[PDB]
Design a protein around this nucleic acid. Structure first.
Ligand SMILES: [Mg+2]
Ligand SMILES: [Mg+2]
Ligand SMILES: [Mg+2]
Ligand SMILES: [Mg+2]
Ligand SMILES: [Mg+2]
Ligand SMILES: [Mg+2]
Ligand SMILES: [Mg+2]
Ligand SMILES: [Mg+2]
Ligand SMILES: [Mg+2]
Ligand SMILES: [Mg+2]
Ligand SMILES: [Mg+2]
Ligand SMILES: [Mg+2]
Ligand SMILES: [Mg+2]
Ligand SMILES: [Mg+2]
Lengths: 239, 46, 124, 344, 176, 101, 394
RNA sequence: GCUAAACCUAGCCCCAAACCCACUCCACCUUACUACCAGACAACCUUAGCCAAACCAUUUACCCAAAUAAAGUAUAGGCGAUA
RNA sequence: GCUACCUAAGAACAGCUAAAAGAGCACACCCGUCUAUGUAGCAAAAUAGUGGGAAGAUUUAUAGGUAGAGGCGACAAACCUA
RNA sequence: CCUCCGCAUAAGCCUGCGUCAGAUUAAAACACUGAACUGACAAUUAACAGCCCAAUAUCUACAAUCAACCAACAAGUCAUUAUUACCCUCACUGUCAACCCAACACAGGCAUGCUCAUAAGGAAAGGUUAAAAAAAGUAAAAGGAACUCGGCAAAUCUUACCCC
């Protein structure tokens, strides 16, 4: 089984790289994840999820400029290439972001809060209490991983001394270090749940095989579970 | 229907599925060739 | 089924097999990036044919030729016929030196001259 | 199943084979000028052709592509006939049709194309299929010429003829007593095309003079190294004959003429075939067209193809100038581009 | 020219041709080097002419006039080749001192057979080649049984041959 | 020469020269129609075009213009007495042409 | 930071050596003599190997940290692919030139004369367009690459055929395959232009000065806009290995040194491969600026000062349906500061020659609607092209 | 009397003795029967099962050290068919 | 290599109504609801139409992978060389 | 008289209706002599598709659908730069055919271009008489599903109701 991954590019670029579908085939060849296979050909875009990043021979804050908002078939939300300086990198677009916009990627935490807009990004230590944020990180200098879909957003709860509890869309609390950069606002491409499918042709184009036709008797896990909220998971390492 | 033409003539698939390189790239095919030489096969593989 | 007893020639494979098989022809060059052949004049066997003007020797021998005994031409006979007289001549006077033997035809290595014997640089 | 008559072939005595396949003859030398119309008004303006300016612009266009040129590698010996002589040829024909516009008004409305293919299809001769499931049955011998010149000059009207249609020549056409498959000639099967350089809706159906160029495979030194001293003019003659025959066929099959329906007026054609230094001149006049065995039973008309030897234009370009420059070649070149259509 | 591929025009169909007594090994060893080379060229031309004559006779559906001349030229050229090979081997032993100009070594393949591997003469060395490293040279503990079975088969063959020889000897002693 | 290992030529090495060749050409009469300049031969399976040109211009000294060769595959259908195919030896015919007409 | 390197796709690390090389004073018994890879404990360490004789097919180039043309600073080379974002903005910022909407009155006064026209210009250009669009090849729908240079050379020949009227057009030649080179400074930023367009027109006599000294002195008060979120070195080939030079495509002794009109072609059969109109305008602006700078360096030496005799290097870029005219004029060479004298250029944007061409007649309900022919035609584009072509020879 | 019936030799199995062999030149690890180019990773593992005990879950000579009597003795074995 | 699924590069679909359509009739094409012929037949599964689709959940040329204590499965215990 | 065929490309053993002698015997479902043969004679020559690309770093977001109006969604089938070194050149594989897979000379199956019927190609019939029975085709004085469980071949051209 000569199964080689198509992720063979160790340098960030702008040209969309061609991707190969899998259909539930790992390195052995057996189907391990059912429901994937047969879809329309797509091209992968190298999306830079890390918001704040210094350029070559740079350190201070820098300005950007939104050019054009396109669409990404690999996810639900749409992407938008934002130019700035002497390089162009793909980032996740936010709500009410059109052509000719100006966003800021700062990092110096101030004494008081900053009344930023819904396009620029600032660390959680300079944002007021009760602000719709998105693309929150977990470790300083790691990358945005949580809240990255279409329309998803989180709201700041409270602050203690060096942490920042962020309310996740799953109604679950989660704290993180204060020196973490997170975007402000909501992701674009809203009303995604109202997208009526219509026919199975759309699902076949997206690359999703129909479910199994076997009649499985529901065991004891098919009932409704009225469970309380799980405790807040902490990522701050304490000696 | 007319189930009888169960063979498709092709040399690429034949060489890639039952070739000498594929046979000797695995001790299974090597043992097969050894048994063929022990029996008296004039032709070892394709 | 297909044939098995017959050998693999150049009229069995599809369009992707006609070319890399051949009939055992010796290559005299290589290829480039424009589907061209770069033939090197130093790779084609140059036939050296001597002149046959004043050559008085027929390919067939007459029956009036007397026969003789057959014996292989070993290296010892050639040695005793070529190097032995010179060695005896230089030793009978008083000038032989077992340190240097390159003046009799012996070569310590084969990387000096062109026509080497053990690696065989010449064709035939 | 039809043959592929390649004009730029590497065969030996392919000229006689092409003359047999096209029913053409060859006459060494340029055709005589038409001395039928006596021009009594020879004393008027008459713009003098200043050969000095023509030679100057020719040497300038030659040194532009041969001597000095901002290149980006060295100068590889290969593909040197495609990046040096090929641009020089189109530059020369462009400056010629530009300078010969006041002297010849026919070149003002002429469409000067750059590398356009010319195709032609016809039937010539028959045979008997020896093998196959169609043995003992008569079949036709179809041919096809896929030529692609460098520059063509297409005008609106037809040029003046040279010899009449009922011209007789004692030199018969060459014949062969062998199968046409002996020289490097093969039979394929694809779409039949009869193209001249433009579609039938173009009002410029006729032409003037074409220009060709031999590739790097048919050089002079390569033929001299392969023990082929007399194989220098035969290839030029065969290429010229094939190109002129294809051109005349494409021009005749656009007015309603073919195998059965003959022609009502001859079609004069000119072509200037050159290589990297030597220039050749050939002429042609389409006389007959029926080449099938059913129609070529009592057809005394034969095609005529004139021509001359290959003469060099320059000789060793060095010392930031030219050493030798023959004037008769340039004179014949500038004369073959001033042929005006017969207008009464 | 092209007329050397045929024999004398007067001998074009003379039933039997008188030509015999080919070369021997001693007469070829007695000659020098340029003479032997010219004689080899003459023998090659003669063999080519005889092959052309034989092909023409086979096409004309007629027997060859003298087929022994071809075999004579063949054995003469074979003797010349043997002589020049013996001379080359003697010179190599007097210079380098090793037999067989084709280098190699006794290596065991995957089948467990002790064969003589011949060097192919590459450009790049062997410690970085891609195709040469894929050529394995180890028995691996799974061919010992096959080698033992082949040895038993050869032993059975030899025993049956000896039994046949003994039966033949007994028949010879009984009848005679 | 055939059945002889050729020495590996290095970029810039001496000229590959052969003295005692091991090639045997056969002048076979053409079966079909052929012109007066095309001559048909029969070279072994280990012989190209330039090799045949050198062999014809070095020994016989025949001016050769062009060489066009192809492989001929012998018949393989004749059965013996124990039902077994009989393989015929293959050969390579040539079609050389003269130079000086 | 999320790395883009996959461990399964990169080269795997070699397995560690055996426990025999960690013994001080003990040589291993490997398989370096049998000359074949063994199963029996056999895996040594081979030293590096190099070739003593260089081979063009197996030649490795040294790294960039020791090249003879390597420098500490990085340059920015512009060619025929650098798709600039803010085309006009970057062009005016790198060339230091004031943008003018309308065209000069000289070409208008030369083209409005009814005598300087073809005997049947409309029908001639219509037949030329129809031929180049449909009657050029044997196919039905030709590709843009196979009819763009065709119609370009057809228009060139049509404009050249008027030599019998103006006895001065013989001093021109359509030069094919030419390279440009010009180096300059722009606020402590070393720049260089190096491109190779389709064709160019060179003459023996230079073009007359268009803008007089009045507008030249008045342009000094005009400031240039500068974008802040974007850097002017965007979409440029940033390389450290280069070579500074001020040599143009022709040395001394050439009969046609002075250019006239540059012809850039965007031969591309696909929309993503075709350049934007603003990108084409920026490209032609940069090409004209490089040509003018090379001419200034060749004539007035390599000095950074104001030129008393300005040069005019026109340019035009087509694509198969639209045209973009340009009249460029260089007035100074010192471009280190933005408070000096600027340049002047006349750019004519949005110039369509024809609306659409129908190669095949559309049939809707067994009847035709639009026949074969160029539907919609604007002769103003061809008039402006003829004016720019005849501006050189009065 | 047509169809068709017999005519002995290639040898075949086991003993005693003996330990048996493997390039004339070229091609043979890629599409073996292919002359010629840049990631070197590739073995080291309780065999199982049928049958029998009227089923079957413990168990069932096969294990590669020359004979025999001891002796089928002490022993192991749902203490039983067996070893 | 027939058949279930997946992967990369290609090809196929006249004409009319085209309501914008996983629209209709209908060539070539994918499958086969029924009648008639034979069950040692043309065939260890055929012959014509009456048939459904035929701009897309369609078909197909090439190459590779998923195999029995399993593969696959729009679930027939269907298929894995009659 | 048919053409629901043929010619090429793709896949496939490679010599498989050319000549000569035997044609006494042997395979044609019978004969001439030859698509179910013995030996000898030689076809096919490339320009057709392959046999391919010297490296170090860097660059490539505005589809196709006549692509020019408009309009989208399944978000898409094609491009380079700077430097170093390299001016020896046309070698190799097949060009036959009535042919492949199904034990066969089988009413089975096979991908694209060409005029969708023509310039490609073939013969339902060995002869004698008109037995019964069976199968495939045209229609019939009156009824038009009254025969059959059921409109079961067939031609007219066919509406409404119920379940799923
Ligand atoms: Mg579901
Ligand atoms: Mg279900
Ligand atoms: Mg039991
Ligand atoms: Mg299914
Ligand atoms: Mg539909
Ligand atoms: Mg339908
Ligand atoms: Mg069920
Ligand atoms: Mg053919
Ligand atoms: Mg069958
Ligand atoms: Mg017919
Ligand atoms: Mg009958
Ligand atoms: Mg009735
Ligand atoms: Mg009833
Ligand atoms: Mg019915």
């Amino acid at each position: 089984a000569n199964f080689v991954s198509w992720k063979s590019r160790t340098k960030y670029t702008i040209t969309p790289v061609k991707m190969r579908k899998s259909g539930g085939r790992d390195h052995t060849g057996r189907i391990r994840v059912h429901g994937i296979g047969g879809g329309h050909k797509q091209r992968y875009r190298m999306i830079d999820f890390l918001r704040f990043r210094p350029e070559e021979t740079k350190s201070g804050p820098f300005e950007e400029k939104v050019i054009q908002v396109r669409y990404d078939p690999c996810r639900s939300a749409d992407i938008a290439l934002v130019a700035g300086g002497s390089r162009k990198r793909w980032i996740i677009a936010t709500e009410n972001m059109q052509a000719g916009d100006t966003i800021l990627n700062s990092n110096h935490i101030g004494r008081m809060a900053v009344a930023a807009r819904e396009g620029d990004a600032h660390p959680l230590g300079a944002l007021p209490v009760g602000t719709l944020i998105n693309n929150v990180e977990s470790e300083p200098g790691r990358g945005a991983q949580y809240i990255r879909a279409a329309g998803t957003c989180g709201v700041l709860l409270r602050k203690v001394n060096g942490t920042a509890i962020i309310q996740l869309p799953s109604k679950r609390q989660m704290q993180v270090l204060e020196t973490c950069v997170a975007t402000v606002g909501r992701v674009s491409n809203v009303d995604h749940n109202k997208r009526v499918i219509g026919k199975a042709g759309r699902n076949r184009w997206l690359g999703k095989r129909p479910n199994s036709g076997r009649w499985h008797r529901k065991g004891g896990w098919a009932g409704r579970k009225i469970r309380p909220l799980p405790p807040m998971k902490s990522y701050v390492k304490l000696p | 229907k007319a189930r009888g033409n169960e063979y498709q003539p092709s040399n690429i698939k034949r060489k890639n599925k039952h070739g000498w390189v594929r046979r000797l790239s695995t001790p299974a095919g090597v043992q097969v060739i050894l048994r063929r030489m022990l029996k008296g096969r004039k032709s070892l593989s394709h | 089924g297909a044939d098995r007893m017959s050998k693999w020639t150049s009229k069995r494979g599809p369009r992707s097999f006609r070319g890399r098989k051949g009939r055992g022809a010796k290559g005299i060059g290589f290829l480039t990036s424009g589907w061209r052949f770069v033939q090197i004049k130093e790779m084609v066997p140059e036939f050296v044919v001597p002149d046959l003007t004043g050559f008085k020797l027929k390919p067939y021998v007459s029956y009036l030729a007397p026969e003789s005994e057959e014996t292989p031409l070993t290296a010892a006979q050639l040695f005793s016929e070529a190097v032995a007289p010179a060695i005896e001549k230089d030793f009978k006077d008083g000038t032989f030196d077992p340190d240097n033997l390159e003046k009799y035809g012996f070569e310590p290595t084969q990387e000096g001259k062109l026509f080497q014997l053990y690696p065989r640089n010449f064709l035939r | 199943m039809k043959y592929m008559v390649y004009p730029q072939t590497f065969a030996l005595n392919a000229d006689r084979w092409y003359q047999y396949f096209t029913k053409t003859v060859f006459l060494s030398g340029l055709p005589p000028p038409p001395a039928e119309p006596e021009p009594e008004p020879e004393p008027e303006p008459e713009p003098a052709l200043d050969l000095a300016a023509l030679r100057a612009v020719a040497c300038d266009c030659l040194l532009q592509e041969h001597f000095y040129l901002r290149r980006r590698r060295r100068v590889h010996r290969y593909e040197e006939s495609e990046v040096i002589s090929l641009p020089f040829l189109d530059q020369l024909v462009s400056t010629l049709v530009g300078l010969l516009s006041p002297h010849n008004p026919a070149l003002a409305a002429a469409a000067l194309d750059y590398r356009c293919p010319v195709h032609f299809y016809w039937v010539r001769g028959e045979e008997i299929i020896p093998r196959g499931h169609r043995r003992g049955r008569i079949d036709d011998l179809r041919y096809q010429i896929d030529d692609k010149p460098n520059n063509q000059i297409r005008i609106s009207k037809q040029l003046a003829e040279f010899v009449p249609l009922d011209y007789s020549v004692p030199i018969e056409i060459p014949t062969i007593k062998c199968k046409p498959d002996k020289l490097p000639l093969f039979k394929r099967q694809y779409e039949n095309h009869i193209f001249v350089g433009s579609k039938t809706a173009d009002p410029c159906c006729y032409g003037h003079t074409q220009f060709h160029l031999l590739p790097d495979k048919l050089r002079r030194e390569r033929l001299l190294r392969q023990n082929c001293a007399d194989q220098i003019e035969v290839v030029f003659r065969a290429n010229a004959i094939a190109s002129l025959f294809a051109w005349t066929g494409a021009q005749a099959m656009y007015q309603g003429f073919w195998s059965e329906a003959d022609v009502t007026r001859p079609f004069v054609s000119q072509a200037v075939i050159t290589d990297g230094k030597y220039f050749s001149f050939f002429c042609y006049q389409l006389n007959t067209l029926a080449l099938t065995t059913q129609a070529d039973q009592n057809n005394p008309r034969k095609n005529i193809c004139w021509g001359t030897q290959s003469k060099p234009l320059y000789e060793t370009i060095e010392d930031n100038d030219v050493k030798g420059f023959n004037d008769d070649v340039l004179l014949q070149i500038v004369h073959f581009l001033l042929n005006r259509p017969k207008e009464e | 020219g092209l007329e050397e591929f045929f024999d004398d025009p007067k001998n074009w169909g003379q039933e039997k041709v008188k030509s015999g007594a080919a070369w021997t090994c001693q007469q070829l060893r007695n000659k020098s080097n340029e003479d032997l080379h010219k004689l080899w060229y003459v023998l090659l031309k003669e063999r080519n002419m005889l092959l052309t004559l034989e092909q023409e006779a086979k096409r004309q559906r007629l027997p060859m006039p003298s087929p022994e001349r071809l075999d004579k030229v063949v054995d003469s050229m074979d003797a010349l080749d043997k002589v020049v090979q013996e001379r080359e081997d003697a010179l190599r032993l007097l210079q380098t001192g090793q037999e067989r100009a084709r280098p190699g070594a006794w290596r065991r393949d995957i089948f467990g057979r002790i064969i003589w591997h011949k060097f192919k003469q590459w450009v790049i060395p062997w410690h970085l080649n891609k195709r040469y490293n894929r050529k394995r040279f180890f028995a691996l503990p799974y061919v010992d049984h096959f080698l033992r079975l082949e040895r038993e088969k050869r032993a059975r063959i030899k025993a049956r041959k000896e039994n046949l020889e003994r039966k033949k000897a007994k028949i010879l002693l009984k009848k005679f | 020469a055939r059945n002889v290992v050729y020495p590996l030529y290095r970029l810039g090495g001496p000229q590959l020269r052969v003295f005692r060749t091991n090639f045997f050409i056969q002048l076979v009469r053409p079966g079909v129609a052929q012109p007066e300049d095309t001559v048909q031969f029969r070279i072994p399976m280990e012989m190209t075009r330039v090799d045949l040109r050198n062999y014809l211009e070095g020994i016989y000294n025949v001016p050769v213009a062009a060489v066009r060769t192809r492989v001929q595959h012998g018949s393989n259908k004749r059965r013996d007495h124990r039902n077994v195919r009989i393989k015929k030896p293959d050969y390579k015919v040539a079609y050389v042409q003269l130079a000086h007409g | 930071a999320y790395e883009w390197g996959v461990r399964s796709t990169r080269k795997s690390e070699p397995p560690p050596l055996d426990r025999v090389y960690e013994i001080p004073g003990l040589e291993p018994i490997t398989f370096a003599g049998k000359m074949h890879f063994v199963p029996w404990l056999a895996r040594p360490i081979f030293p590096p190997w190099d070739r003593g004789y260089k081979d063009p097919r197996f030649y490795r180039s040294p790294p960039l940290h020791e090249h003879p043309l390597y420098k500490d600073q990085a340059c920015y080379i512009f060619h025929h692919r650098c798709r600039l974002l803010e085309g006009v903005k970057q062009a005016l910022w790198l060339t230091k030139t004031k943008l003018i909407e309308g065209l000069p009155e000289k070409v208008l006064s030369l083209v409005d004369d009814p005598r300087n026209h073809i005997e049947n210009q409309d029908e001639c250009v219509l037949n030329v367009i129809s031929h180049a669009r449909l009657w050029q090849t044997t196919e039905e729908i030709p590709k843009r690459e196979t009819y763009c240079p065709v119609i370009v050379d057809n228009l060139i020949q049509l404009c050249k055929s008027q030599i019998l009227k103006h006895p001065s057009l013989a001093r021109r030649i359509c030069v094919q395959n030419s390279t440009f080179s010009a180096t300059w400074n722009r606020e402590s930023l070393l720049l260089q232009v190096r491109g190779s367009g389709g064709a160019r027109l060179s003459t023996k006599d230079p073009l007359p000065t268009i803008a007089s000294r009045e507008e030249i002195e008045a342009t000094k008060n005009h400031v240039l806009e500068t974008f802040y979120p974007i850097s002017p070195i965007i979409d440029l080939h940033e390389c450290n290995i280069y070579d500074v030079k001020n040599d143009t495509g022709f040395q001394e002794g050439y009969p046609y040194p002075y250019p006239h009109t540059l012809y850039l072609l965007d031969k591309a059969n696909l929309r993503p491969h075709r350049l934007q109109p603003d990108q084409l305008r920026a490209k032609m602006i940069l090409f004209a600026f490089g040509s003018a700078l090379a001419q200034a360096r060749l004539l007035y030496g390599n000095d950074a000062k104001v030129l008393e005799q300005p040069v005019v290097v026109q340019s035009v870029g087509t694509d198969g349906r639209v045209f973009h005219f340009l009249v460029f004029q260089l007035n100074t060479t010192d471009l280190d500061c933005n408070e000096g004298v600027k340049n002047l250029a006349w750019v004519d944007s949005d110039q369509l020659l024809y609306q659409h061409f129908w190669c095949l007649p559309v049939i809707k309900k067994r009847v035709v609607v639009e026949p074969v022919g160029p539907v919609g035609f604007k002769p103003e584009t061809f008039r402006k092209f003829l004016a720019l072509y005849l501006h050189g020879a009065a």
